Amino acid sequence: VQPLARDAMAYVLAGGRGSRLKELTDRRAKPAVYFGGKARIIDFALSNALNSGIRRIGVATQYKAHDLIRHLQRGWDFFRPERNESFDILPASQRVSETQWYEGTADAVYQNIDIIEPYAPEYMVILAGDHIYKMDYEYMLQQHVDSGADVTIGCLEVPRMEATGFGVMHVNEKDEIIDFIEKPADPPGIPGNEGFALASMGIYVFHTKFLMEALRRDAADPTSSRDFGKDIIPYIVEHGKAVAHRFADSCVRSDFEHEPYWRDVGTIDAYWQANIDLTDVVPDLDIYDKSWPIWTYAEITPPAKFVHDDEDRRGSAVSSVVSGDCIISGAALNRSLLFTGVRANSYSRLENAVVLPSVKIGRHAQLSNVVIDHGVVIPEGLIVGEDPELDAKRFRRTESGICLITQSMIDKLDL
Amino acid sequence: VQPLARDAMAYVLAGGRGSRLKELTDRRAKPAVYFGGKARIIDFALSNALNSGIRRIGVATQYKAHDLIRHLQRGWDFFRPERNESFDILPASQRVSETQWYEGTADAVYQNIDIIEPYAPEYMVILAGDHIYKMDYEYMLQQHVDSGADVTIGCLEVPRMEATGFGVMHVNEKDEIIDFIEKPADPPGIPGNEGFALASMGIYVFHTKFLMEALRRDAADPTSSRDFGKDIIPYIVEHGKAVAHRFADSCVRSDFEHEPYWRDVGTIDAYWQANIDLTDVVPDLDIYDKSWPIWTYAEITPPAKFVHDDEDRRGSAVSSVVSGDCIISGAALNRSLLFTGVRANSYSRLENAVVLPSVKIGRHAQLSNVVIDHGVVIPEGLIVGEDPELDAKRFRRTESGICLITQSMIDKLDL
Amino acid sequence: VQPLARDAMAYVLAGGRGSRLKELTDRRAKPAVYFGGKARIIDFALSNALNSGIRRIGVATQYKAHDLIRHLQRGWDFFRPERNESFDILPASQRVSETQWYEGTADAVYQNIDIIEPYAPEYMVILAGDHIYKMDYEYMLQQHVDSGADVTIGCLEVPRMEATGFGVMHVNEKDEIIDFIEKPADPPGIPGNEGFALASMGIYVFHTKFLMEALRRDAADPTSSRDFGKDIIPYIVEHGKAVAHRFADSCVRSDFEHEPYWRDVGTIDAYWQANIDLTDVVPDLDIYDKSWPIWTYAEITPPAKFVHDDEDRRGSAVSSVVSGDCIISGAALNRSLLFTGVRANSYSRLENAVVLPSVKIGRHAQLSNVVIDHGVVIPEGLIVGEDPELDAKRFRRTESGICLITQSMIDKLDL
Amino acid sequence: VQPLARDAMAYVLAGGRGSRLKELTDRRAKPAVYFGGKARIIDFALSNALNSGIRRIGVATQYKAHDLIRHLQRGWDFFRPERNESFDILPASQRVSETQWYEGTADAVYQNIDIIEPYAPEYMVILAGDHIYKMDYEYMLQQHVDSGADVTIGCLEVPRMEATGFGVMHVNEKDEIIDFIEKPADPPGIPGNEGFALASMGIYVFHTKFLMEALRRDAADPTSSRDFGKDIIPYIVEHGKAVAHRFADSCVRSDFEHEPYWRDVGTIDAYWQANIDLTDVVPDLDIYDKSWPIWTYAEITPPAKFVHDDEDRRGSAVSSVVSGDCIISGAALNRSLLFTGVRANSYSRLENAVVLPSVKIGRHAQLSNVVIDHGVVIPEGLIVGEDPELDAKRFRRTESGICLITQSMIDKLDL
């Protein structure tokens, strides 16, 4: 009768460096990266835990975490322990530690068992903090207890050619994991649906007591790189019972989302695409869904403003999404996403632009196919997107032609 | 040495019905009317008290107060008594009286004395809750203390011809009030500067013990209409000492505000004018000023979205202010201010439009010079601002061509 | 799979005057009556709904409810609509109704249908807000959906002689209600257990749309006194399907509670008894339980302090419960419960005393078997509990010897 | 005109080890040590800034301050940047720096200049976060700007023999500092009263721009140990102007505090004494003063409970302070201070005991003249305070007879 989320703790691995996002993550961990206009990536998993009814959340942090920790401290500040709610921020440090960082994703939980055991949750819900997706974890929890599994693993149903870039679960007709393979050149297909392979999401459910014993034996193992995907999980698939849970079963799909939505935004192109796709008439991700809302940190902000309408300048946005506290003053916006605080000045033009918070666009600048980092001041008259070899020498530029622009890159300019 | 605001409490009168605002205040008192894109009228006085350092606030309410009380409960909820802050909502009901409503502005303070005296503030700052202005009440506090006045009155400096519609304080050369005239045909000028008269703002400062003793005499006097402006203050001007405080000395002007800003928005024209002027390139009210911020009730909302760009339709805003959670779908906005949550659909057009929260504009509608009430659903193809005689018959149309449109007006059409 | 409480709105009936509490409810509704040392009575129903996972709460109050509304504003202020939470305070008022009073328990919901319908909850959980008990409403929701009932009713299983003051359900083989009798002088008994009767808790579960329709039918019928127990429920017992849910199946019992706990505290004796029993070594109600906590309004308070220890006076408490902000200054406390903020001075003695917040006990006063109302100042040397005839003349005194003491009574006296 | 606290940023140095508190700070920084029954030491300085009107607070901690940072996250969480409030937690780390450690008190501010300067405060109020005192910083701000000093230094007026442990400021008739000597064996006195000497409170006021330039002067000097007391303060007395502000002018004294109160509880003796003194009839520190309240992290806790009263046992507290969620089960308490959550079981005795949160006293245990660490479980029948030689063998014992007891010592115990 009782929901099992009542007795579960969500534990979010938020130590991801996000290496292939390059300078976008030079001073932030990937879970702290802005997404979608107002939120950060970490907010999806946290909101899934919230919307699912989980009232104890732990977040393990690591690489360049001040920015993530501060966002966590003020967006996620409303859990009250007297109501059996908790939100613990757990950066690798010198606690019982006194040895720098976490040795791996399993160590990120092991080091904080002293936090978990007093709460005594019945179930642990391990989550990757660096993906955008909406999911109701109570489905996973019921499957796990109904199946008698030692671990239940969330998996996407992906066409097997696309599955080559994934950790792939080899499943029988009972959906038991009979093998796990890192990045198979030929991914094992699902029995009876061999065009698709199951791609591990990095979402794991255990009984808390089993997991604590498993972490402890892993910690005593010198062989171990102290990682779920490489050490913990392969052990269970061999000598224990590992079961696959299908994202399509638990994904929360608004009526305006044509398929289960999940994005890794692991490269600059992917990050640009997922943000820019929110400018579509019918986006893949419905940021207007009220049924499974995404909480994040937000401030009371003034509204967006458009000024100037003369022969030579008009402030306007077309096929764009514009956040609060944006002043579009004689600037022409097309197919662009502006986060909070942006200032675009007269005669500047933006096309195919992902513009992070508090950016300033100087007069006469013209930019196409760009990601502009937080707080960048674009100088007057700057042109991006016209000359590929000039843009490549000045900025981080993808093969497909997207330019990521940081303040340090601007600072090095006078051509 | 100590700032006097520590020992002051603000008392806001928010029973004002907004009569000449007509259907706009049929379902909500004037202080609860929306202004500027996000806030409500009452948030200005409240934010003034907060920014000036006043830690105790009471608000007297009366006429259709549910919206007002719901706004105060949800937005002004962060005061903690252990920190010697308080925020009291004081409607009229079955208190220590128990039958009817408040008898007047002074009665609205006298009925709730049992709440004031336990706080024992040294100063009462009496404020009207139905005007838009920014004021640092610390200046008025120290003038009252240093003047020995029984009451210090906030007064606007106004060219005499426009002072004919105000309560006007006839003042001497020490700025002491020697008479008070309700709407003088030829308002007495300021001595030595006879082009200007002093218009009462309805802002009154007292020592608390004097105010209580004065409120009790008024309550005893069965001939009193139980009002500040017409009973109490006319007595102190005669037998006591009343001193005027000039708005210009304490007004908080942004760098981008060309003069002290104060608006009553008492008419549909004044209300339309004050909102629409926020679409100016240089507005008189700088709503982006961060040095004296206006607090209000706000929720996390999605950003604003502009969509469709073909030969028949383009979603976009020009010379316009658009709040969050607005979707401009193939609609063309110009010189318009949209509060939060508006949906404007394909082929619709808005010009000189003040659009309150949650409005839906049907496809192909075209509206010019309008105030659209909260929640109104505009039917497909509706035209306003083309035929004055038809517009006047369907809705409330001002002397100047502004149409106020309410849901009940929309229900009556189709005949 | 999904918890039923996700789709429910708890609607708390908090209009009840509790007239048999006499002077205890003269200046506050019964749901605002303090209980247990910190909380108020309404806090149990509200905490039950919170702990059961219901995210939408409405509370119906009267207009004699300034105390109750202030408590809900300050204490139940942490719901955010963006997270699909809502807390609605619904007093009887002139919203779109003109009249300022609710006709009865059914009308208290009918008048606010315009609030419930936009939320569109799948289920309504109607609760009486004037009882002390702990209950997991998810059980009742699951029974209501699986039984197909038109209304499920929460029922205490009690000996039939004590069922004589309740509304009682006669019920068949499968716990379906075949008849409802109001205070039967000889109540019907359960099949296979005709020694016990099922007495109505005033807790009702409906499918939301059924309830709205039934609430509309009832508002039309002028025979109806506008009540759930008198009108709505008996209607459906006859014409529809009513099923009883037994409190023993969903009561939340701490390990230190020997049976399911529900109390009415409808008489002064019962109120006194329920509070004083908390000073037992093993109380019936475990207020130290963390698994089902009671949320309330609380402030940071200084600790309790006991002072003086000479031949004449000792400040200490024996077999007693003492709250924060309490100074027991040379006073002797035995089997007494002190709410927050009490001051008891030298040579005073309290025994069997339920002492509400902010009470002051003057020196040399001696009080026995009393309930002392909020804020009462006891004069030095007052004796209560030694002279039955004189206590009776001077205070509210029960048949059992408990004296209720209000400030009104204290003032009336020199003898 | 305006209070100067509006333009001030309080900057709290909270890195101190508190080494001569020994095992009491083995895993907590000194500012995070509990004091008074509920608050922690850092809360006083923080509350001073809040009650003084300062709205921007910075707190420098030394990296692995997990208990301190968690305290600030949960307790000091109510500052909203949209209202120009800010509360920043700044641990020594690697964001724009990389040193892993703050090289001194000056370096603790220097490293976070990039946080301070965007706020553009006009004044900096540098505070030591490891002392217990109540002070209104507005008085010190007025004097700093009225006197034109470069630095203004808070100082206590103390007898010279007791000043030998402090940084001492030699004064003149104008209270201008002529020299600063660290720990003078024979301290200079003050003109007109040479029985006393000015001891540095470690509180400094600067004009923000002077301080920034000063911090940049210091960093570029390899001679400097990057310390406020060692380097920057003496620099200015010699070359610039430094002026003494005397605590007695700005200390916030209750009606019941017989002299300005300040403790640095640097020893175990001092810590014990300052806490046990709150058990007095007339304590030096009035923890019941509601006019300069101490804000802290707190939860809704159950009341305190005293149970059992036969000839074998009696649970009671005499001349003691007992916090919430304390259960005194058949335990004898006298002149003891109990923090929240303490459980004392039958036949146990506490005397001259300072008992930190969540301690469990086993049955038959009898402890005298102790400080018991957070969360310690006292074994059944343990005796402390009867054998000085044995107690010294098992615990940390001061010369004066005070035993400090941690769980580690308890675990090492057979005899």
Numbering used by the authors:
A (entry chain C), B (entry chain D), C (entry chain A), D (entry chain B): 6 to 420
Publication excerpt:
The allosteric regulation of ADP–glucose pyrophosphorylase is critical for the biosynthesis of glycogen in bacteria and starch in plants. The enzyme from Agrobacterium tumefaciens is activated by fructose 6‐phosphate (Fru6P) and pyruvate (Pyr). The Pyr site has been recently found, but the site where Fru6P binds has remained unknown. We propose that the ADP‐glucose pyrophosphorylase from A. tumefaciens have two distinct sites for Fru6P and Pyr working in tandem to regulate glycogen biosynthesis.
We hypothesize that a sulfate ion previously found in the crystal structure reveals a part of the regulatory site mimicking the presence of the phosphoryl moiety of the activator Fru6P. Ser72 interacts with this sulfate ion and, if the hypothesis is correct, Ser72 would affect the interaction with Fru6P and activation of the enzyme. Here, we report structural, binding, and kinetic analysis of Ser72 mutants of the A. tumefaciens ADP‐glucose pyrophosphorylase. By X‐ray crystallography, we found that when Ser72 was replaced by Asp or Glu side chain carboxylates protruded into the sulfate‐binding pocket. They would present a strong steric and electrostatic hindrance to the phosphoryl moiety of Fru6P, while being remote from the Pyr site. In agreement, we found that Fru6P could not activate or bind to S72E or S72D mutants, whereas Pyr was still an effective activator. These mutants also blocked the binding of the inhibitor AMP.
